[PDB]
Motif scaffolding. Structure first.
Motif, mmCIF file in Angstrom:
data_model
loop_
_atom_site.group_PDB
_atom_site.id
_atom_site.type_symbol
_atom_site.label_atom_id
_atom_site.label_comp_id
_atom_site.label_asym_id
_atom_site.label_seq_id
_atom_site.Cartn_x
_atom_site.Cartn_y
_atom_site.Cartn_z
ATOM 1 N N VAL A 104 0.964 -1.202 0.009
ATOM 2 C CA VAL A 104 0.144 0.209 0.390
ATOM 3 C C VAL A 104 0.382 1.407 -0.171
ATOM 4 O O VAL A 104 1.049 1.560 1.318
ATOM 5 N N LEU A 105 0.959 2.464 -1.308
ATOM 6 C CA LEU A 105 2.154 3.075 -1.459
ATOM 7 C C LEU A 105 0.598 4.365 -1.331
ATOM 8 O O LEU A 105 -0.142 4.567 -1.216
ATOM 9 N N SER A 106 1.571 5.488 -0.819
ATOM 10 C CA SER A 106 0.854 7.047 -0.881
ATOM 11 C C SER A 106 2.304 7.820 -1.240
ATOM 12 O O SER A 106 3.164 8.376 -0.957
ATOM 13 N N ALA A 107 0.752 8.856 -1.865
ATOM 14 C CA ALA A 107 1.404 9.875 -2.576
ATOM 15 C C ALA A 107 0.982 10.796 -2.453
ATOM 16 O O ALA A 107 0.257 11.582 -3.746
ATOM 17 N N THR A 116 14.012 4.369 5.245
ATOM 18 C CA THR A 116 14.190 5.811 4.363
ATOM 19 C C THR A 116 14.815 5.648 2.912
ATOM 20 O O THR A 116 15.852 5.015 3.076
ATOM 21 N N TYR A 117 14.058 5.329 1.839
ATOM 22 C CA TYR A 117 14.563 5.611 0.400
ATOM 23 C C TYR A 117 14.699 6.478 0.189
ATOM 24 O O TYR A 117 14.374 7.251 -0.250
ATOM 25 N N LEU A 172 10.954 7.814 -0.562
ATOM 26 C CA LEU A 172 10.239 6.855 0.023
ATOM 27 C C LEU A 172 10.726 6.343 1.752
ATOM 28 O O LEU A 172 12.198 6.530 2.261
ATOM 29 N N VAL A 173 9.888 7.232 2.388
ATOM 30 C CA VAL A 173 9.430 6.692 4.014
ATOM 31 C C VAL A 173 8.796 5.566 4.413
ATOM 32 O O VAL A 173 7.337 5.497 3.550
ATOM 33 N N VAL A 218 7.178 12.378 -2.751
ATOM 34 C CA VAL A 218 6.882 11.990 -1.344
ATOM 35 C C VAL A 218 6.346 10.876 -1.255
ATOM 36 O O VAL A 218 5.391 11.154 -1.321
ATOM 37 N N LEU A 219 6.910 9.375 -0.974
ATOM 38 C CA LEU A 219 6.623 8.318 -1.098
ATOM 39 C C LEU A 219 6.144 7.664 0.018
ATOM 40 O O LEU A 219 6.807 7.934 0.967
ATOM 41 N N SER A 220 4.831 6.885 0.510
ATOM 42 C CA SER A 220 5.096 6.505 1.969
ATOM 43 C C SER A 220 4.312 5.096 2.185
ATOM 44 O O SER A 220 3.244 4.933 1.460
ATOM 45 N N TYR A 260 15.038 -2.589 -1.957
ATOM 46 C CA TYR A 260 14.012 -1.768 -0.914
ATOM 47 C C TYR A 260 12.827 -3.344 -0.649
ATOM 48 O O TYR A 260 12.191 -3.142 -1.568
ATOM 49 N N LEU A 313 15.950 -4.657 3.759
ATOM 50 C CA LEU A 313 17.323 -2.988 2.476
ATOM 51 C C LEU A 313 18.770 -3.564 1.815
ATOM 52 O O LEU A 313 19.050 -4.098 3.199
#
Ligand SMILES: C[S@@+](CC[C@H](N)C(=O)[O-])C[C@H]1O[C@@H](n2cnc3c(N)ncnc32)[C@H](O)[C@@H]1O
Ligand SMILES: C[S@@+](CC[C@H](N)C(=O)[O-])C[C@H]1O[C@@H](n2cnc3c(N)ncnc32)[C@H](O)[C@@H]1O
Ligand SMILES: C[S@@+](CC[C@H](N)C(=O)[O-])C[C@H]1O[C@@H](n2cnc3c(N)ncnc32)[C@H](O)[C@@H]1O
Ligand SMILES: C[S@@+](CC[C@H](N)C(=O)[O-])C[C@H]1O[C@@H](n2cnc3c(N)ncnc32)[C@H](O)[C@@H]1O
Ligand SMILES: [K+]
Ligand SMILES: [K+]
Ligand SMILES: [K+]
Ligand SMILES: [K+]
Ligand SMILES: [Mg+2]
Ligand SMILES: [Mg+2]
Ligand SMILES: [Mg+2]
Ligand SMILES: [Mg+2]
Ligand SMILES: [Mg+2]
Ligand SMILES: [Mg+2]
Ligand SMILES: [Mg+2]
Ligand SMILES: [Mg+2]
Lengths: 383, 383, 383, 383
Positions: A91-94, C43-44, C51-52, C91-93, D44, D241
């Protein structure tokens, strides 16, 4: 006199729909907490992931992973066996915030003057072909995928998978339905059952019970899982995106469309609200008996509250000269951004439910109600 | 007699369009290397990234980052100042291969029998409203965003940014155009110029030179950057997705639509090929003078080669009883998957160019050509 | 007697450190709201994104985009010119919650009994080579990158970019420093300045003011931007990841290391808390004068509160037989998970500051304080 | 005399290791096609995805999804039941090309003069504690996780899952091993077996057969799945990672480390090649009998071919004054970038195999061979 018209629908397990459901699932959650939130959420879905992005500016605090996982879970994908799994998928979020440049034109000092979320045109439609004043083809296609999903969940056909699509083409003579020429039904399944069995089972459980036996004749042609194999489906077999079911979401191709999606956007987005308001007057006009079928069309300009265009089309089936019929429209309803929201009370979390199986036809939706009809009648030869 | 119709278009700098361009940019590259490749590419675009995914099964070897970066670059975003930058943005990829389950129904032993890539319905359209037999509203809207892009690239208005949208509504009386009531033009810009100047400049450079002076009167209303500020745009102000410009891609809402997007899919995908072929016969019918305007509609079933439905609508403007007009259609053209591809020679990298400013209207496109007209004439009162 | 030892450091503008900063920036924000939160943030960072992700279980409500954009912003990347931009980057999460399976072993009924967040070994270290009891090589290398960053921010050398790395090798004879053989300093820059100038400027502004003139002789060799060109840097020139500066974060390679990173984890994570506690006793022992230099090492078992191993190494420089020196250790300090957190008061947002330029050497940090020394002295020949 | 030293290892099913494996799996594939390719691949890994990114500049043409899915598949995750699935997980890619700025300093006209891939320091190590001249603690810990993996694959303990970690602490008296105080073994499992059974089984099948019975006494303490439950593991329970197993990859914490990861990088990267070359001389020195144990350390400067620092540490166990022992080092081996690659023939796809269970100790690896020993002997009191 005679001619063929085809429409189609997709199950709640269809990639694109998964997106919509997710998209509108997030908005609802958000709205529940803050009705005046500004949500523009776009979702992307593939093999092992779900991408929830776009721009959201709200004071609410929500959990995207939970809303997402739960939403997919309910859809049905809960094992790698079916290709996707709410529990183990990514589940990704931007998600950024809405641009202030846009906002200054939407939310102004005076709430009434508040402007349209964007520019664009929307089409409303109504027809006396059915009780819910909806076209027939889209109504039956929807019923088909909906049945498949219910016979799956109730365990009638345990080997059915979420992913499925349905197509039906009606025979139209003398402008009315005389029957159905071809029926298409594609549904994902397990490695456990055979094509024939599957085909034969789909007829008894899904098609035969939903399609009126009158319209089915020895002529009708049935297309069930044509490639001969549909074991791989969902995001693994096809990429899902938000707002890519524009037509099945509305009228099946019977009426026209402007190009604006519904899911993921709050009501200040005319793409969704002006659209609903358009089905509202169209339906209400036909219920009012002022026409047998009429298409409405409004267009807007970003940051501008007053509609840039309005036009009613009754295809000659009108009963009062269009003139008064068009002057009656702007007379009775308020199509201004902050007029339709109150008109239909859109500041509530009632959209997820709208993300699968059509946005129109469900009489319990605020825009499906016909209260203004009788009054729209008084404005022209009441009696 | 009188009524208003509105259409809209978007610049090549619009998020959604950026996607389409990218999507079709990848296919072309691929096709150049392998014409029989199977490409279903969906692109997602936001603030600092670009997501190219979907399913692709080809023997070709391409570079997504390069095709992408270059594609965006050409669009225009090359500095953080405009919000997005081809050189410094992220390029993500989630591309799997096409499901064999689908493939078995598409590519069969005999190439002719080869089936439709999916189920669905498509709408073709033609009208004598213009030389290219395209509706007028969509034609002028496209011209507006196209001009804006050109006045930007040539340096006439250096403070213009890629992102822009355009809306126009025509006055229709006696079924013909009498003028234009409202004009909408939104364009991204630099922090260097003021609204008034901008507005005044847009009129002289972009609107005045494109809209026929006859249709412009003291009545016409102009909406230029209404929120009062559009400095933030591109993926930063709005999420871009593939196939979300379904309508502006086709006929502006004048004609109907089935729900199939174009960009990112090879010709074996009826959504794009049957659609093109539909514009082909519709245009060819009007050119053949068999009707003033006609809408065509075909529908298919996955893995099945023979169309599930076909219907020609001439709105009474036909000159030969529909009967022979419909029997002529299936007589002259081959709508079978592997018949339209040869019919229009779709096995070439010619789609990127089709991703911005309409899929129809460009006479040099294989589906815009009208060669079968005169022959479609011979089949009915030649003379 | 004579031998060479080399250490290195990296600017806050280095991709890896950017990650760390971000990771520990999220934790602080969270902790500020909830001190007992469980944060495992990885984080990447690359070209146009950040990427957090990881697992976080807290009652706090934070904004990742804001914390992230602001953290990068402060580092320095604010224009596409430098390759990365806090305002226009993605910024992705991908943040899920901590597995309950781990949790049951960490947080038990009795808080004291509460167990180690994971299994593993940690190394503490102290040396009288400097006032802050830190090794010299790592101290000067940090100073070098730190100076470059300061001369950049203050505008002394405006053409300096955030990305930079520093390497120094000392001459060790008779076990003490006699000088420095080679100096390495790599820093990103603008297309505006030339190599020679840059090199000459780096010496005056960054190297000459930081390295003791005594240790610099005609022998020392200077390596400044060797490839001859460093205009491209940051995530564009090199992928940044959390926990990949394990060594510069601690002692520069002079002491040992177990493999546990620091940033992104809350104190219940022995990798960070047991590590700090280890520097605490080692420093305190040398301050107490019980040894000139000693390395400490503890190891833990997930879900287990009591350390699995402890060993003090004084390299013969001890002043009290190791025996009492080791029995004194477990006598004075509590290395149990829920003993070190109180011991050092780790439930506070004090970690971002620790993400760049060393976790040791800053006397204001709770683990750098030496209060137990004098008392650690009483336990052995006070006088 | 007496003291405790602890080391640890992780199964090939550990998130971090999954990354490494993936990373080095991509390199090999590439190298197979092009040995002189420049690969800096960072991976990752989380819940339902795998991110392969970094900078790669090669003429090779490879398939990331395939290499990835296959690599994870072999590891063992093939069902949502275990939390991750090679077939249904997401595979993402963010791979750009190597910065030319770095390249000019690496590949120069003359291949010999070719420079170090980056700046940094590396530590090599050797000890006569064991036949393969490796420290004991890390050797047994590797054996433990390696056994678990094998007892899982051979079907001995079918309920074992890929994820697992192992910790062992030895008793060191008189500088030699006397036994083992504590044993830690954590392994993921199925919902089908109970803790006691599991624990009892782990001892018989994994610990008892691997740990020397001599070193096991009634004193030894065993820690098996302490939290009491480990059903959830893999990327679902913990973020994986690349390059986060720096220590278990090398010597278990017995020797020192500079901070450079191994997986994902081609040999032109001194982090991996200088590292290997360092184990090569250290091992060869002890084999040559010049010392019982010795730590080597080299450091480099980007774009610079000649090492910036070299130092040998024999901890007094040397047999020839360090002097000649250090002058012998630079005499016999070439630590220049383009000297070690030929020295060890590193331009081959031999790294994936090195991504799990230690980079040292496997005598068939080119750096594990001791051919220069006898010749390193001739250079000092041959006899
Ligand atoms: C035909 S697929 C799209 C084409 C595909 N992207 C390709 O690579 O050709 C679109 C929809 O068809 C359905 N579908 C997938 N596999 C199918 C199969 N084997 N038979 C019939 N329908 C299928 C799903 O609901 C899916 O969303
Ligand atoms: C109005 S936006 C979508 C709504 C937005 N996502 C929100 O959060 O309300 C759609 C398009 O309008 C245009 N646009 C963006 N900012 C604008 C502004 N300040 N004024 C006018 N048009 C704008 C862009 O081309 C953009 O793709
Ligand atoms: C040398 S790069 C690592 C190798 C790289 N991944 C590649 O593609 O070869 C690592 C670090 O060196 C520094 N660096 C980058 N470009 C450099 C240059 N041209 N000269 C010196 N140092 C540089 C940065 O701080 C960067 O994070
Ligand atoms: C303990 S976790 C790291 C902490 C985690 N990020 C958190 O949210 O607290 C790291 C590793 O321990 C192992 N592990 C995971 N769950 C475990 C459990 N319940 N018992 C023992 N070891 C476990 C796995 O090999 C995993 O990669
Ligand atoms: K798709
Ligand atoms: K959008
Ligand atoms: K890197
Ligand atoms: K982790
Ligand atoms: Mg779709
Ligand atoms: Mg719109
Ligand atoms: Mg859009
Ligand atoms: Mg379709
Ligand atoms: Mg690094
Ligand atoms: Mg560890
Ligand atoms: Mg880790
Ligand atoms: Mg390094």
């Amino acid at each position: 006199a005679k001619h063929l018209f085809t429409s189609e629908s997709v199950s709640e397990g269809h990639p694109d729909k998964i997106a919509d459901q997710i998209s509108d699932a997030v908005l609802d959650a958000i709205l529940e907490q803050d009705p005046k939130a500004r949500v523009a959420c776009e979702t992307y879905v593939k093999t092992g992931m779900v991408l929830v992005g776009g721009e959201i500016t709200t004071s609410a605090w929500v959990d995207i992973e939970e809303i997402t996982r739960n939403t997919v879970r309910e859809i049905g994908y809960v094992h790698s066996d079916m290709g996707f799994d709410a529990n183990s998928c990514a589940v990704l979020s931007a998600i950024g915030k809405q641009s202030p440049d846009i906002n200054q034109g939407v939310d102004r000092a005076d709430p009434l003057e508040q402007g349209a979320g964007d520019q664009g045109l929307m089409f409303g439609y109504a027809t006396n072909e059915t009780d819910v004043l909806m076209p027939a083809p889209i109504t039956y296609a929807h019923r088909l995928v909906q049945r498949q999903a219910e016979v799956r969940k109730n365990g009638t056909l345990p080997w059915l998978r979420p992913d499925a699509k349905s197509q039906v083409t009606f025979q139209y003579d003398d402008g009315k339905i005389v029957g159905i020429d071809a029926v298409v039904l594609s549904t994902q399944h397990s490695e456990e059952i055979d094509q024939k069995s599957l085909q034969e089972a789909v007829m008894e459980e899904i098609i035969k019970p939903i399609l009126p036996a009158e319209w089915l004749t020895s002529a009708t042609k049935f297309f069930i899982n044509p490639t001969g194999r549909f074991v791989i489906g969902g995001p693994m077999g096809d990429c899902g995106l938000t707002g890519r079911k524009i037509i099945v979401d509305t009228y099946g191709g019977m009426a026209r469309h402007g190009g604006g999606a519904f899911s993921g956007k709050d009501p200040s987005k005319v793409d969704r609200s002006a659209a609903y308001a358009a089905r509202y007057v169209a339906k209400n006009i036909v219920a009012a008996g002022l026409a047998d079928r009429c298409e409405i069309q409004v267009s807007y300009a970003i940051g501008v509250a007053e509609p840039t265009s309005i036009m009613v089309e009754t295809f000659g089936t009108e009963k009062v000269p269009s003139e008064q019929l068009t002057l009656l429209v702007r007379e009775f309803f308020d199509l201004r951004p902050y007029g339709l929201i109150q008109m239909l009370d859109l500041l509530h979390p009632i959209y997820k439910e709208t993300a699968a199986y059509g946005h129109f036809g469900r009489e319990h939706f605020p825009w499906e109600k016909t209260d203004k009809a009788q009054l729209l009648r008084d404005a022209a030869g009441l009696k």
